[PDB]
Amino acid sequence: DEEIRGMMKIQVQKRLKWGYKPTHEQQLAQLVTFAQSLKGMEMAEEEIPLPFLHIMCGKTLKFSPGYFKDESTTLDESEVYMMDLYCERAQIKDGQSILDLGCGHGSLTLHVAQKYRGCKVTGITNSVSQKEFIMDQCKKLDLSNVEIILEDVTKFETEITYDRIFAVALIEAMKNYELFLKKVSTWIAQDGLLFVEHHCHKVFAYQYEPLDEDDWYTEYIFPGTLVMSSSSILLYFQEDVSVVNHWTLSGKHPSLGFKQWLKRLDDNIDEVKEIFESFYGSKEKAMKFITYWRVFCIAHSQMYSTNNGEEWMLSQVLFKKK
Amino acid sequence: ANLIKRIEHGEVSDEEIRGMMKIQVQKRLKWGYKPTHEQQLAQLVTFAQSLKGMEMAEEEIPLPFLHIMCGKTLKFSPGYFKDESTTLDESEVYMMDLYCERAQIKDGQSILDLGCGHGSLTLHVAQKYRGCKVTGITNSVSQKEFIMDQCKKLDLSNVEIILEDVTKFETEITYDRIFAVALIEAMKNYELFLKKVSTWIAQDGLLFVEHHCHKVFAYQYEPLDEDDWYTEYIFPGTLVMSSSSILLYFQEDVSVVNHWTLSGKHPSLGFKQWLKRLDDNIDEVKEIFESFYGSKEKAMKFITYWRVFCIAHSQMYSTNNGEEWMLSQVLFKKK
Ligand SMILES: C[S@+](CC[C@H](N)C(=O)[O-])C[C@H]1O[C@@H](n2cnc3c(N)ncnc32)[C@H](O)[C@@H]1O
């Protein structure tokens, strides 16, 4: 842990001199050549055991961050505050069709559905198990409210349109932001909104690709080249959607989230070893998936804490059609 | 406000002004900078949505004087100094070329220029590409006729100047290219502006826009405390100092194709050049002014304003090596 925090504060500082430039002309230009580059990519590049997440992620199994109001906010609680923020900032109304892109394990689909029994809430994931699990909760807590399409978002067509489209933690897997925002806009209703949240740097976007030959990080964690977006970056993909509002949250909310994920992991470790040996068929491999998750949490709760959250952070954009 | 009174009578040094203007800049930068990006972003966004409910815009100098103060094109907007030893004349010409390149001007296109002014950019484009029909748009009577006389001087059946306020111009002509160089600074509600202009863009047309801005935050010109001479001395009459980024939020009728900024060094240097040529001919601007305005005192009054205005903004644009106040250029396609 200790050395890894250190081995990651150095990765941070060299990603920090990478992307910062001494004048606004150079800074801005770099970001505008970056966006144009992602128009030369595909829309997106072309399975975690459920027992293990009941431990690491908390009640709703929200595999994305939460709003911590103070550092006594439970991880459980933070998950709730964040998704009411979502619901508040998406201007969600009782009775409107809701589409939830990349449900995961439905933490938001079930939230809206329970908080607004008038809304018909439709979710989309590419996992058979996420779908079944979710539809298990509907069963349990009496929801004729939900629907789970099974389809890869980047493939899905439909005639159906939606009063409010959600899409959180999803941009992180998309290369061409243009084709993505292009497709989703034909799913927007007469006068509807689209809610995008996304990890980012405050100031510059970039590919997940080695700084040195001596930065283990980009290889161990990312293993494929993703894009760490820039907070403002979606302002440049406004051809089929228009920005209505734009917010950001300090990087202390992810940093705290990762902090919660690591402690519960480490509080229940024996059970974690047991679940991952059943699943990966080996004490060596379990002992190495434990390592990953700890390193991911440690490193990234240190990556987001940077400069009291004023480097990497959460970014929220609200959209309307055309 | 007796300050102004003695400011006119010459008692206040050019470095007191530059001195007071530095404290103005410090106050404005303390006011506008938030400590978290969440706040800063929500400063701008609220200020941006604020503009959406205003009017587009709210409801004249001697030519011998601009001839003196300004370059031989009379560009009343900034120039591009590759170097400190670049001249006003070249700075101008460098800047309009830059425009002619960033707006993808080709021979043959039709060009709509909005707030053409005394025509520096209209005539630049028109002499350079005989293939374009260029339409200028100003509301000054003097400005139409001047350009129309320089069109006789240069022999170019290549220009057209319509006398109208942009804010109320109604047409169904479309032009492959449109400039709005140093114009949005007269406007407040950019949405309703950008919507009007967007009907003037032809299929695959391009609009090009320049505006003075601060790098980060935007703001109305209202006095900071009650020690703020500069605000209501320099401005009538609430205008809005845009943000670099602010026009990323006005993308309902036009899309963005590119976006650049230029250091506040260029506008800093021009204003410096404006002062020198004005001061290397003070007596000629005195005559020109004591003749035009009707008295030696409003002469005094208006010669002071311009020395003040050249000195404050030149100081203001130099803050932090050109990285607070600054130029934003944005190129749009018809959404
Ligand atoms: C990686 S995110 C995080 C989970 C979710 N955003 C949340 O906050 O609960 C999105 C989720 O949607 C699914 N997903 C990811 N990419 C997808 C794609 N291209 N098409 C469909 N589902 C996808 C994944 O199974 C993943 O759990």
Ligand SMILES: C[S@+](CC[C@H](N)C(=O)[O-])C[C@H]1O[C@@H](n2cnc3c(N)ncnc32)[C@H](O)[C@@H]1O
């Ligand atoms: C210095 S700028 C643009 C001209 C500059 N010479 C150039 O092309 O770089 C300011 C100009 O805005 C124009 N303007 C402001 N409000 C206007 C309006 N409502 N209608 C027409 N022109 C307007 C004025 O004529 C003024 O010359």
